[PDB]
Tab-separated table of C-alpha atoms and ligand atoms in Angstrom:
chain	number	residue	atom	x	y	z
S	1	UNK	CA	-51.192	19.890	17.214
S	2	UNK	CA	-51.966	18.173	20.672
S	3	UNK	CA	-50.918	14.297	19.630
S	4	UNK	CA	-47.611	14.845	17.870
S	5	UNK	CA	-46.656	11.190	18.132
S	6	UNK	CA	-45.054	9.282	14.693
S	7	UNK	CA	-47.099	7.224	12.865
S	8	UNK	CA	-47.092	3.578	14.100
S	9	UNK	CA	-46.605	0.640	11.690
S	10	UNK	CA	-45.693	-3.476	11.623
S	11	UNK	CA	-43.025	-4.408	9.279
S	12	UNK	CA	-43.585	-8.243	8.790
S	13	UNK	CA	-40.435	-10.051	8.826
S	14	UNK	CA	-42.254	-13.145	7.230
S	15	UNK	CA	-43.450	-11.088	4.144
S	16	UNK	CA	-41.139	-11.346	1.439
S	17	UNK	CA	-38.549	-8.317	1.375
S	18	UNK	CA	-39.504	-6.236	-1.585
S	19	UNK	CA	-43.574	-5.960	-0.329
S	20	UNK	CA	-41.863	-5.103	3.820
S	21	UNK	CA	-42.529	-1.471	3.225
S	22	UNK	CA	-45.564	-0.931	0.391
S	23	UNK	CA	-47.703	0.544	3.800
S	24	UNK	CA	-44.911	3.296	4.741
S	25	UNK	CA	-44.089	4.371	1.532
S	26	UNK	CA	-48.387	4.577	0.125
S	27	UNK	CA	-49.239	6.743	3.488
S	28	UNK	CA	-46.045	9.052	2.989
S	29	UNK	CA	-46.216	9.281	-1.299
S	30	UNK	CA	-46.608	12.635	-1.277
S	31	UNK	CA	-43.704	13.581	0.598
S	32	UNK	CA	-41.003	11.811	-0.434
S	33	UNK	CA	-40.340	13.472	-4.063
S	34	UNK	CA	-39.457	16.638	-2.420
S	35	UNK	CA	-37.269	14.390	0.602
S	36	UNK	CA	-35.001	12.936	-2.338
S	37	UNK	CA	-34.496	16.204	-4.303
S	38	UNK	CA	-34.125	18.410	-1.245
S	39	UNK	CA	-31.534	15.467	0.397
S	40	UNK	CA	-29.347	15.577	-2.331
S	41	UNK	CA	-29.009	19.228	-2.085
S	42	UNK	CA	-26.371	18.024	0.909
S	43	UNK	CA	-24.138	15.905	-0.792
S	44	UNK	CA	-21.087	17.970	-1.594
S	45	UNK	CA	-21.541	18.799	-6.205
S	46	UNK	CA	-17.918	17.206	-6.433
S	47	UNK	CA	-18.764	13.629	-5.550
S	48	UNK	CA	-21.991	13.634	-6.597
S	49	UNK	CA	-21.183	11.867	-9.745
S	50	UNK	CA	-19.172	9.421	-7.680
S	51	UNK	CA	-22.200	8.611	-5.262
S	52	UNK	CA	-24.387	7.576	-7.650
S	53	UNK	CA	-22.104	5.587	-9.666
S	54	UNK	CA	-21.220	3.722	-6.636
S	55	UNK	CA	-24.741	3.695	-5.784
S	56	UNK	CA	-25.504	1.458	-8.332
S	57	UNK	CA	-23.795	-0.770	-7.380
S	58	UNK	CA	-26.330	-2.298	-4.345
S	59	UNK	CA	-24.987	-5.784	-4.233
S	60	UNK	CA	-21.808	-5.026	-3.055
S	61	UNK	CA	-23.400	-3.357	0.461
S	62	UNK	CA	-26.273	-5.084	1.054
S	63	UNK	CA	-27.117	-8.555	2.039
S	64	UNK	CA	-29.943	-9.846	-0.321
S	65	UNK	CA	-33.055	-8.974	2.091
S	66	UNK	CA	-31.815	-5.623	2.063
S	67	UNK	CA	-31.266	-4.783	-1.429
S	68	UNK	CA	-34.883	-6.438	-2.070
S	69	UNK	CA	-36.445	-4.091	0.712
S	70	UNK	CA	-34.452	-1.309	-0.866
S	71	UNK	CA	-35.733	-2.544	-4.548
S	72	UNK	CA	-39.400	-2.378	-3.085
S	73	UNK	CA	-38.583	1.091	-1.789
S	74	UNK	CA	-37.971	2.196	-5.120
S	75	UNK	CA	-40.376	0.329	-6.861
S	76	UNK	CA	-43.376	1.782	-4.559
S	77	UNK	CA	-41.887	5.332	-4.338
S	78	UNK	CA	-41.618	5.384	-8.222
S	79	UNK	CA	-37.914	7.106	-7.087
S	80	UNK	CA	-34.456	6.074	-8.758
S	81	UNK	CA	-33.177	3.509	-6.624
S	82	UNK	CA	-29.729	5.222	-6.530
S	83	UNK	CA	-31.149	7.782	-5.517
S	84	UNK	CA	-32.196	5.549	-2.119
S	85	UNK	CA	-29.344	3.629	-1.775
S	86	UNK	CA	-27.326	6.785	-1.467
S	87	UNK	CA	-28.862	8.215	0.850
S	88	UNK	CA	-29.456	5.522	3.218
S	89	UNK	CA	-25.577	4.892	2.831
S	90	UNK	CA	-25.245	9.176	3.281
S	91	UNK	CA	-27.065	8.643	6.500
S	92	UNK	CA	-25.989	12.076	8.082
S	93	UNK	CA	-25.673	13.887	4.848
S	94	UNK	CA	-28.538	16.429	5.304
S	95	UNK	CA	-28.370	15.830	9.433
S	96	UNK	CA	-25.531	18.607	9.260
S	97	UNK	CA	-25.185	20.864	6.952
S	98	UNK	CA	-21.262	21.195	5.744
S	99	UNK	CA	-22.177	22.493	2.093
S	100	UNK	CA	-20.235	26.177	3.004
S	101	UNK	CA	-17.178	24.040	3.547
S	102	UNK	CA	-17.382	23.337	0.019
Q	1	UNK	CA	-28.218	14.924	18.122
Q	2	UNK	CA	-28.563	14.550	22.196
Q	3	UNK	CA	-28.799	10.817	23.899
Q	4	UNK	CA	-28.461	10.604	27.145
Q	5	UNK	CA	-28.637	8.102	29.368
Q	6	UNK	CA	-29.647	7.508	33.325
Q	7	UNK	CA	-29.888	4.577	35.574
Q	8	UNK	CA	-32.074	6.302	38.588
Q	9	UNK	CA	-31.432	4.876	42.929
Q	10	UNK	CA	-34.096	2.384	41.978
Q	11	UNK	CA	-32.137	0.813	39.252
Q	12	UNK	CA	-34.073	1.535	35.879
Q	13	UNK	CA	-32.387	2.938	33.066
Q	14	UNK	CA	-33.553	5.651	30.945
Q	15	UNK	CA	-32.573	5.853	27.389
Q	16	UNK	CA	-33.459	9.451	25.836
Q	17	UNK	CA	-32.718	10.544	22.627
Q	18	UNK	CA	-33.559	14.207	20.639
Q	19	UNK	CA	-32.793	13.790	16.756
Q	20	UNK	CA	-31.304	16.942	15.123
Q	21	UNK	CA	-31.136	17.307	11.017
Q	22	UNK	CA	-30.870	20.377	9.231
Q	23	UNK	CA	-33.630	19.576	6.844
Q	24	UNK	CA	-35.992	19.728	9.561
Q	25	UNK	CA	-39.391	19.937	8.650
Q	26	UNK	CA	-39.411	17.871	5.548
Q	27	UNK	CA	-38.230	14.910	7.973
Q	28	UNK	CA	-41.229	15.889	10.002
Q	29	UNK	CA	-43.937	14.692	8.014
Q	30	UNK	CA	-41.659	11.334	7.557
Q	31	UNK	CA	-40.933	10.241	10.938
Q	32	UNK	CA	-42.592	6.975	11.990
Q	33	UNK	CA	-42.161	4.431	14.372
Q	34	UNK	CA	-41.745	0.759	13.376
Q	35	UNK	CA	-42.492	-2.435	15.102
Q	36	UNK	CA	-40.381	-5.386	13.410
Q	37	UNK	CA	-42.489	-8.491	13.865
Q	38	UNK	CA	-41.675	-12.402	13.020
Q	39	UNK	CA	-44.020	-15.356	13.836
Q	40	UNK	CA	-46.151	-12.599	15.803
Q	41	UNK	CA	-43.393	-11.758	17.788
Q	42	UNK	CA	-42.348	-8.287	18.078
Q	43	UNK	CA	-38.355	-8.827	17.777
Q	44	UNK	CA	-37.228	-5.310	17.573
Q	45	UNK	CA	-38.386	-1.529	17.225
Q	46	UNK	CA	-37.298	1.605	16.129
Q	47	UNK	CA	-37.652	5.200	14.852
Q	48	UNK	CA	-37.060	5.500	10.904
Q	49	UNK	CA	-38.161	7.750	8.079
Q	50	UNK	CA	-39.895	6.686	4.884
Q	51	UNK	CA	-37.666	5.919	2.181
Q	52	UNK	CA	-35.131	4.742	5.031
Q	53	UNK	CA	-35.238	0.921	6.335
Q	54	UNK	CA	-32.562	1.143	8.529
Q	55	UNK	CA	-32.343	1.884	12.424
Q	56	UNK	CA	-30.402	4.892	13.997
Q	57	UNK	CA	-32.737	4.746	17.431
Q	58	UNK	CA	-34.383	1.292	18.079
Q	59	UNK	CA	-35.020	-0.604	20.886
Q	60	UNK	CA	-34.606	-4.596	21.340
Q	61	UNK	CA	-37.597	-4.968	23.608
Q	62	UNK	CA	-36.640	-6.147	27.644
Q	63	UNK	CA	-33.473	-6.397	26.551
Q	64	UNK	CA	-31.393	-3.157	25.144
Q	65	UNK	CA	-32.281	0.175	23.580
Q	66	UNK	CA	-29.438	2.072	21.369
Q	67	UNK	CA	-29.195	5.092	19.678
Q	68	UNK	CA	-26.290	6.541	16.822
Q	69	UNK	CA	-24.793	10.095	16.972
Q	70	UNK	CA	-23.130	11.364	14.250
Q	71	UNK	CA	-19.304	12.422	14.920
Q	72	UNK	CA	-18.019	15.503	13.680
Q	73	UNK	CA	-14.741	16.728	13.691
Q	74	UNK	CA	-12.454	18.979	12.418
Q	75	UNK	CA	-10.599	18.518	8.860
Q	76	UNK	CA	-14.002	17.629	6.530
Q	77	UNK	CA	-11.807	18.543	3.475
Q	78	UNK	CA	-8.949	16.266	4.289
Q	79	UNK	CA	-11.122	13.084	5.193
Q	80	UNK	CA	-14.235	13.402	3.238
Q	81	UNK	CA	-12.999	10.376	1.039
Q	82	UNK	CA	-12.524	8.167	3.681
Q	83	UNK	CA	-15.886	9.370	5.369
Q	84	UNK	CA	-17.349	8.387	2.356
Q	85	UNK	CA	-15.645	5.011	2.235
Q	86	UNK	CA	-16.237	4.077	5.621
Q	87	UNK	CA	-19.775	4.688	5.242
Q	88	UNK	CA	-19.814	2.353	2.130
Q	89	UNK	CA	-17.871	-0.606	3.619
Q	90	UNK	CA	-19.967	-0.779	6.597
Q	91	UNK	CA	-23.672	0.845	6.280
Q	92	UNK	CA	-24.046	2.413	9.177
Q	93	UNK	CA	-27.993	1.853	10.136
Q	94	UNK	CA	-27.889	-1.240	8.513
Q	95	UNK	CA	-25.639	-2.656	10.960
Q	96	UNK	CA	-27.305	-1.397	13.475
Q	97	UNK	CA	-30.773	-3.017	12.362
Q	98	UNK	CA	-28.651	-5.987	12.030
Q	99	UNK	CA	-27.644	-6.130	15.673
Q	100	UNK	CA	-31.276	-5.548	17.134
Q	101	UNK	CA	-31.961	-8.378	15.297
Q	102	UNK	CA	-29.793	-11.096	15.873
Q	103	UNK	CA	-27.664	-9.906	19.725
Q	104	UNK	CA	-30.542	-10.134	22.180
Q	105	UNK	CA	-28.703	-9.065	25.461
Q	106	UNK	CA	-26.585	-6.015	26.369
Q	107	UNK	CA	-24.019	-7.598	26.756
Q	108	UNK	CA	-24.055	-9.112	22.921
Q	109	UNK	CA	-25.013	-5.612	21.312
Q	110	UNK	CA	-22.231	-3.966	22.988
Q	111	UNK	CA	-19.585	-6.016	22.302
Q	112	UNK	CA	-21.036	-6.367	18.821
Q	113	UNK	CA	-20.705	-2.226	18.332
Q	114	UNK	CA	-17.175	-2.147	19.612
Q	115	UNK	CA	-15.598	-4.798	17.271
Q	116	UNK	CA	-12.089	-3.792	15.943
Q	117	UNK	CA	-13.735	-3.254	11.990
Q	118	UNK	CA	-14.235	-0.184	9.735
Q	119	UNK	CA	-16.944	2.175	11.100
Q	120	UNK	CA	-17.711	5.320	10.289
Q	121	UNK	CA	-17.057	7.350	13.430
Q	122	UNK	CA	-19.789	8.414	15.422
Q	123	UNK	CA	-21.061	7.723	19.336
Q	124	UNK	CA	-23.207	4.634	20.156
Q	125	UNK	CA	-25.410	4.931	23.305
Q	126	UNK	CA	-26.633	1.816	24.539
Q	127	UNK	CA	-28.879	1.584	27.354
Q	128	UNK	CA	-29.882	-1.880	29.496
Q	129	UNK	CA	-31.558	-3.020	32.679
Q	130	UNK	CA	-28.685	-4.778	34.936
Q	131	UNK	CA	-26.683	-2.343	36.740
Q	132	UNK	CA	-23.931	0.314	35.404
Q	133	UNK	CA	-25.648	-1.219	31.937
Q	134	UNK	CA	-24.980	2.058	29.812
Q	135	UNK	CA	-22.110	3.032	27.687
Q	136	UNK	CA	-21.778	5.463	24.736
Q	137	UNK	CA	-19.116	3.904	22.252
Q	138	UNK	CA	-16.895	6.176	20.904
Q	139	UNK	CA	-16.341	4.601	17.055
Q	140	UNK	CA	-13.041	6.440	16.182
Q	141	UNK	CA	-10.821	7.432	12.790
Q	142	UNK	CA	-11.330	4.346	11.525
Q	143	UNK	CA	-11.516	1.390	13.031
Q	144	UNK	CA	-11.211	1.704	16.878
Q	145	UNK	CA	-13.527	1.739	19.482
Q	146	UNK	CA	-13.485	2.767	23.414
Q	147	UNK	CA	-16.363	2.165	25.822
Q	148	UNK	CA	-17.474	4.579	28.733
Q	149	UNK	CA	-19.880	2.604	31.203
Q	150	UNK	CA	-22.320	3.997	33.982
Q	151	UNK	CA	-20.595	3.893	37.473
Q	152	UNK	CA	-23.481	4.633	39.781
Q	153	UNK	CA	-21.286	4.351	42.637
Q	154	UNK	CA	-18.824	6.660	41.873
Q	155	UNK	CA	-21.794	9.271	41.538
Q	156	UNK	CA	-21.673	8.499	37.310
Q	157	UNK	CA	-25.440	8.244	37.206
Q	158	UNK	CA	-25.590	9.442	33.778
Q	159	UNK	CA	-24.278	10.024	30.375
Q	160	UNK	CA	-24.315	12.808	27.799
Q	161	UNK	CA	-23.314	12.574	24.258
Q	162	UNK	CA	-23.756	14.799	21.353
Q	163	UNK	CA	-21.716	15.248	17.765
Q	164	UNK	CA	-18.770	16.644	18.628
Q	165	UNK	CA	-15.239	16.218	19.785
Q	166	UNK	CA	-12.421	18.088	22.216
Q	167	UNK	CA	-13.008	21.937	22.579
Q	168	UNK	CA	-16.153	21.780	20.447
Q	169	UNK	CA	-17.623	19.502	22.690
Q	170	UNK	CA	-16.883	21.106	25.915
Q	171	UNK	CA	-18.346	23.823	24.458
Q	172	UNK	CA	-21.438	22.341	23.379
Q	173	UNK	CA	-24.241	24.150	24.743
Q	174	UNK	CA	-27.205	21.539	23.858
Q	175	UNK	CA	-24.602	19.057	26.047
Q	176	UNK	CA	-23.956	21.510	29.064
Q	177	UNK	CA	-27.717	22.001	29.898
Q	178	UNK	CA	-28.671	18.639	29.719
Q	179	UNK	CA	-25.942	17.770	32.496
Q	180	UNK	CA	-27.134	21.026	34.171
Q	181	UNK	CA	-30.682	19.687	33.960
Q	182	UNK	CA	-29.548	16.012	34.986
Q	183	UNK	CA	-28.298	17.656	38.436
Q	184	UNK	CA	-30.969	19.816	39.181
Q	185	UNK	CA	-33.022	16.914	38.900
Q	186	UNK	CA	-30.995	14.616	40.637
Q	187	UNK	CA	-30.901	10.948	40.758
Q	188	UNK	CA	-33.203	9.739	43.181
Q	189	UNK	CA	-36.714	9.517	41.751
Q	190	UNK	CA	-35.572	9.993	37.857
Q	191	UNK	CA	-38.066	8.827	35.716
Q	192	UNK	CA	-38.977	8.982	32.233
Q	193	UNK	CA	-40.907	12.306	32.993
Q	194	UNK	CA	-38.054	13.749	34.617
Q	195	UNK	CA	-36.077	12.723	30.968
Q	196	UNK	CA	-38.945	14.627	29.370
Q	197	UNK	CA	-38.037	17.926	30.790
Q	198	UNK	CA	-34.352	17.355	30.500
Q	199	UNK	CA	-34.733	16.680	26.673
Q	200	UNK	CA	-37.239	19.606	26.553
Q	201	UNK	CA	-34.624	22.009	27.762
Q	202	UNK	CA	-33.647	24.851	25.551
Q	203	UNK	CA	-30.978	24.425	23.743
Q	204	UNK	CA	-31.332	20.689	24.025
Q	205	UNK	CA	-34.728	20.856	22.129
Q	206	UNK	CA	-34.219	23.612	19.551
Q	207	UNK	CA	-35.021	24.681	16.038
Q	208	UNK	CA	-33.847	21.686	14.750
Q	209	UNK	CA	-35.025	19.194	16.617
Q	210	UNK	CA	-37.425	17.036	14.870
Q	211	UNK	CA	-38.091	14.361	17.881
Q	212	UNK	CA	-37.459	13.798	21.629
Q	213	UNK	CA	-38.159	10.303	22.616
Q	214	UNK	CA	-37.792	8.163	25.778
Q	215	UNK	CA	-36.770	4.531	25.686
Q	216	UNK	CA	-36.937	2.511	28.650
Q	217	UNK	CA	-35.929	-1.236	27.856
Q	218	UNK	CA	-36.295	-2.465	31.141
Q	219	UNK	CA	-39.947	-2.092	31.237
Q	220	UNK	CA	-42.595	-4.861	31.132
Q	221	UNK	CA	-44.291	-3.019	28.341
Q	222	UNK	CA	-41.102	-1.528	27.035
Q	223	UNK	CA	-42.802	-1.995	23.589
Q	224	UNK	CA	-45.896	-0.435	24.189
Q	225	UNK	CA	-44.444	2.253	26.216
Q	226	UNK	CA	-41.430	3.019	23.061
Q	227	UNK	CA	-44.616	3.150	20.930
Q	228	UNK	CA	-46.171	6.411	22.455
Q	229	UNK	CA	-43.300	8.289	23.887
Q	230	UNK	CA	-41.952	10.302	20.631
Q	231	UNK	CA	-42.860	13.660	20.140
Q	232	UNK	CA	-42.638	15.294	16.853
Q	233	UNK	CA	-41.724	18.827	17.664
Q	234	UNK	CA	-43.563	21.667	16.358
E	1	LIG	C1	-44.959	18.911	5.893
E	1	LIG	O1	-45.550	19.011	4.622
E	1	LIG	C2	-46.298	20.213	4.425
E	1	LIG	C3	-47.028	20.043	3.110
E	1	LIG	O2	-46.540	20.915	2.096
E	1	LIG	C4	-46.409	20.333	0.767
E	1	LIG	O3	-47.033	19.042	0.642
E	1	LIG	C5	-46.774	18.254	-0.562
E	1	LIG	C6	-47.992	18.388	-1.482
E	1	LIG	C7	-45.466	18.619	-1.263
E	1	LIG	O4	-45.684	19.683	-2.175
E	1	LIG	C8	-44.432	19.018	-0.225
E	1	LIG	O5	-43.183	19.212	-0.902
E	1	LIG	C9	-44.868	20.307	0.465
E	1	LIG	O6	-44.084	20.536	1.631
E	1	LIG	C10	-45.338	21.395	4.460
E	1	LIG	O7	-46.068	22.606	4.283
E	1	LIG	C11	-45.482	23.366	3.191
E	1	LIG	O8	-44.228	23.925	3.608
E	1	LIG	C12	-43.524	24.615	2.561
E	1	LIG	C13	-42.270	25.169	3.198
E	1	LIG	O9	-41.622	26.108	2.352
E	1	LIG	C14	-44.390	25.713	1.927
E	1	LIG	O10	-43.735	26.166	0.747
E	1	LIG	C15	-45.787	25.214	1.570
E	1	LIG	O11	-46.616	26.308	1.196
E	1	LIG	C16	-46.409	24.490	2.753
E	1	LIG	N1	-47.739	24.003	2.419
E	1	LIG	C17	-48.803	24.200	3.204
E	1	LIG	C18	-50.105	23.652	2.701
E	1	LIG	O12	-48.721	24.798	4.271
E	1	LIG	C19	-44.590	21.418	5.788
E	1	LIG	O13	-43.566	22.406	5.744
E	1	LIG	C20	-43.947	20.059	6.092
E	1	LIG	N2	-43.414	20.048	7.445
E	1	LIG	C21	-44.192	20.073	8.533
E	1	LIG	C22	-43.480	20.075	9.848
E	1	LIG	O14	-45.415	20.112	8.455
């Protein structure tokens, strides 16, 4: 109510990639199954099926620390990890929503 | 999305930023604040969400603070594909973790945001300490970049940016208060408070805001200061 600040947390560049984000994701578990199914809500139906095929595909966008941190992400959400590569890619996707376009 | 940035008679530059997302209250409960640390050094800060390791409002501490606005314009049917491939070929908050980690002067981040490359269009803010440092970077359709500095002595104490373009920008009403506000408040004696109010303005702050924050890199304890200043709206 009166403190409305966000939660503060250290992300250790020395730890090894996949373990950078096991604090975040433990303290916010409950939340995010209902982030990832409400998020892709935004994505337009048509390319759905393209987003998550290209999705897959994580070595081609990443550099190797980042596809282990996103790897860890997934592993410690317990969420498809195309799922999380999409949307981190679809950064604006639910920012705006554009769905009565389609 | 509103950033705006100052630089105030005194010379300090104030970097303030109000997210905007549809999904708005689900974010809520998501929104942290990160401090990226190496050899016990904090090298670089920024709001994220869980789930999301990249940085769309971070802060390289003493150095430069930047924030990312989407870019909307007309024709969403006849682009979307190369939206979508943009946005592939060049992850957007990726790169822009990548830059508060390895350009550690104004200078370096802005010429690293307005290289000639694929970018998915949107408006970079980027706010430093020496004087006239702050520019929003217009990325445009698709590879091209222009710059638009401070120019505190022509009277161009500050800079607005939101998400759109041409007539829909001009006729942005969460943009047109906050200049309103700006010059009510003037720029002698504009602090971080004073961006407080301005981003607390209605229609600036509305129903989908989920945070207002207020970045000042110049500080001594920009860190500390970056780590207490957002406000998750109610
Ligand atoms: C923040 O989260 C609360 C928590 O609600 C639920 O928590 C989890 C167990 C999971 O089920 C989430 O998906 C839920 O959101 C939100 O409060 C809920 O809001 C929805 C909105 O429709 C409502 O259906 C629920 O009854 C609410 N639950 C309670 C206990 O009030 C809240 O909306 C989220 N946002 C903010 C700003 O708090």
């Amino acid at each position: 109510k009166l403190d409305r600040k966000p939660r503060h947390y250290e992300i250790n560049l020395d730890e090894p990639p996949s373990q950078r984000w096991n604090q975040v994701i433990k303290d916010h578990l409950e939340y995010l199954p209902g982030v990832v199914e409400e998020t892709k809500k935004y994505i337009p139906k048509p390319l759905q099926p393209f987003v998550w095929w290209a999705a897959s595909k994580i070595d081609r966008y990443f550099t190797t620390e980042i596809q282990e941190e996103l790897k860890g992400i997934a592993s410690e959400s317990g969420l498809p990890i195309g799922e999380i590569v999409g949307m981190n890619i679809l950064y604006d996707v639910a920012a705006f929503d554009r769905r009565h376009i389609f | 999305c509103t950033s705006i940035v100052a630089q105030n008679s005194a010379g300090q530059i104030i970097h303030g930023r109000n997210l905007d997302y549809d999904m708005t209250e689900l974010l809520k409960n998501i929104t942290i604040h990160v401090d990226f640390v190496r050899n016990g050094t904090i090298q670089y800060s920024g709001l994220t969400f869980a789930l999301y390791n990249g940085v769309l409002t971070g802060q390289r501490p003493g150095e430069y603070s930047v924030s990312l606005n989407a870019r909307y314009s007309g024709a969403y049917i006849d682009n979307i594909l190369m939206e979508f491939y943009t946005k592939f070929k060049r992850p957007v908050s990726f790169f822009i973790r990548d830059v508060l980690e390895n350009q550690a002067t104004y200078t370096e981040a802005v010429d690293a945001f307005s290289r000639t490359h694929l970018f998915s269009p949107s408006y970079i803010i980027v706010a430093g300490i020496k004087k006239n440092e702050g520019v929003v970077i217009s990325r445009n359709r698709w590879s091209a970049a222009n710059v638009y500095p401070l120019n505190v002595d022509a009277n161009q104490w500050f800079l607005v940016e939101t998400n759109f373009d041409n007539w829909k920008k001009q006729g942005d009403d969460r943009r047109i208060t906050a200049i309103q506000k700006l010059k009510e408040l003037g720029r002698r004696n504009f602090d971080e408070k004073s961006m407080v109010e301005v981003l607390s303005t209605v229609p600036v702050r509305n129903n989908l805001t989920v945070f207002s924050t207020v970045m000042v890199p110049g500080l001594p304890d920009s860190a500390d200061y970056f780590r207490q200043s957002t406000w998750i709206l109610p």
